[PDB]
Design a protein around this ligand. Structure first.
Ligand code: CL
Ligand code: CL
Length: 162
């Protein structure tokens, strides 16, 4: 297991524009197109990202291409963030992957609001962090996913994904 397989499990793959769990237009492996209610606006953001006239449909390869870029951008966002970087740098490889999944889902912005859990992770107080993270809108809205990521931080293993 690795970050790619982990996220491919959490996000799925869809080759046609769809609405995510918050109703925003998305495509591929959890790649958000736009927060606008407009389908047109989304199809336009899609064409710009792919560099062709897609008509709201992409190929698997294109999906995978967006996905690579999006994983990259997530990691780089963490590295560039003064509050996150030292957390991330303090952890083992499995737990870092859990942190990337969160940022991928919620953005740096969303993640950076778990200050208290981040400080607990940095101290390696796993069980406490796990409990604090569960007190969030994130856990309430996408509980099965949130549990999978929370167990990953808690244990340092991939068990929630097998
Ligand atoms: Cl893009
Ligand atoms: Cl869920």
């Amino acid at each position: 297991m690795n970050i790619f397989e982990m996220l491919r499990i959490d996000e799925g793959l869809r080759l046609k524009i769809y609405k995510d769990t918050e109703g925003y237009y998305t495509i591929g492996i959890g790649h958000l197109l736009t927060k606008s209610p407009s389908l047109n606006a989304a199809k336009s953001e899609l064409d710009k990202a792919i560099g062709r006239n897609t008509n709201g449909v992409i190929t698997k390869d294109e999906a995978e291409k967006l996905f690579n870029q999006d994983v990259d951008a997530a990691v780089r966002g963490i590295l560039r963030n003064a509050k996150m970087k030292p957390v991330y740098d303090s952890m083992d490889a499995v737990r870092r992957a859990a942190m990337i999944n969160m940022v991928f889902q919620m953005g740096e912005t969303g993640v950076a609001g778990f200050t208290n859990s981040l400080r607990m992770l940095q101290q390696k107080r796993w069980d406490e962090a796990a409990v604090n993270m569960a007190k969030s809108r994130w856990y309430n809205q996408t509980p099965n996913r949130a549990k999978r990521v929370i167990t990953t931080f808690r244990t340092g293993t991939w068990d929630a994904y097998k």
